[PDB]
Design a binder for this molecule. Structure first.
Ligand SMILES: NS(=O)(=O)c1ccc(NC(=O)NCCCCO)cc1
Ligand SMILES: NS(=O)(=O)c1ccc(NC(=O)NCCCCO)cc1
Ligand SMILES: [Zn+2]
Length: 257
């Protein structure tokens, strides 16, 4: 199966997922001088006060925190979006070194990691239907740079020892994802895709301008996870990011000047 190694990495994915070479693939480089300020873009509405986290899971390609998405408990609205999008999960992509790890880039700059808060459009009823629609998902992407610690990330970091290998999960209730946001909600937006197979072209991307800072100790804990399952040769879960894809016939819009 697909992964991030020499023999199963992003350059191989098209053989099983031919949309990898499609017209609206993600991630992309955000060229800040070519993005256009759109004054019609509304501020994002992030409503996470009632979020109910459930589990944290090592899925063999990242780790993810899952939420109860059976009601409008944690929703994203506004911005470029029509309608209400429910938070299903968040996960990260990160590097083996601090100068790489993000999926999106900004003027070709790579960040140490990137957080994806994944939401689905409630008009489609469930996430499986939503992935089949051009406006089915909204992913809020947040860059991580290495510097001061992020207090709201620490509860995640401290449980990673319990989900070291693929398939492991743990209870992860009462986690507040608002602790992962930066101060500003200024964003870029463009139509794109999932950045892992099946690479479905169903995502409105909303990428925040302001990165969050995490400490070296926090990102080191990401890098101690394993791609492999327990009892298999150990391969550290690092560099689980897809590189920037061709922008093709798309314009990136900015909510700010
Ligand atoms: N989805 S993908 O990136 O196009 C892909 C799928 C299967 C493979 N298969 C593979 O490498 N098989 C050899 C390993 C089997 C022994 O455990 C590689 C890449
Ligand atoms: N890295 S990313 O672009 O934020 C991303 C987000 C969701 C997913 N997949 C997802 O939500 N799947 C829901 C199950 C699909 C049902 O067939 C894959 C990649
Ligand atoms: Zn992702």
């Amino acid at each position: 199966h697909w992964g991030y190694g020499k023999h199963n990495g992003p350059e191989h994915w098209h053989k099983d997922f031919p949309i990898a070479k499609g017209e609206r693939q993600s991630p992309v480089d955000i060229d800040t001088h070519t993005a256009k300020y759109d004054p019609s873009l509304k501020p994002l509405s992030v409503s996470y006060d009632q979020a109910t986290s459930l589990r944290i899971l090592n899925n063999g390609h990242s780790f993810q925190v899952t939420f109860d998405d059976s009601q409008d408990k944690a929703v994203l609205k506004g911005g470029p979006l029509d309608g209400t999008y429910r938070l299903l999960q968040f996960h990260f992509h990160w590097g083996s070194l601090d100068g790489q790890g993000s999926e999106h880039t900004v003027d070709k700059k790579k960040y140490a990691a990137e957080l994806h808060l994944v939401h689905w459009n409630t008009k489609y009823g469930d996430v499986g239907k939503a992935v089949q629609q051009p406006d089915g998902l909204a992913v809020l992407g947040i860059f991580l740079k290495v510097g001061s610690a992020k207090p709201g990330l620490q509860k995640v970091v401290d449980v990673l020892d319990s989900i070291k290998t693929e398939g492991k999960s743990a209870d992860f209730t009462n986690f507040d994802p608002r602790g992962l946001l930066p101060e500003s909600l200024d964003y870029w937006t463009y139509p794109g895709s999932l950045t892992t197979p099946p690479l479905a072209e169903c995502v409105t991307w909303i990428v925040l301008k302001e990165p969050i800072s995490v400490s070296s100790e926090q990102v080191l804990k990401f890098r101690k996870l394993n791609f492999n399952g327990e009892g298999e040769p150990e391969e550290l879960m690092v560099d689980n990011w897809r590189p920037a894809q061709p922008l093709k016939n798309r314009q990136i819009k900015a909510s700010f000047k």
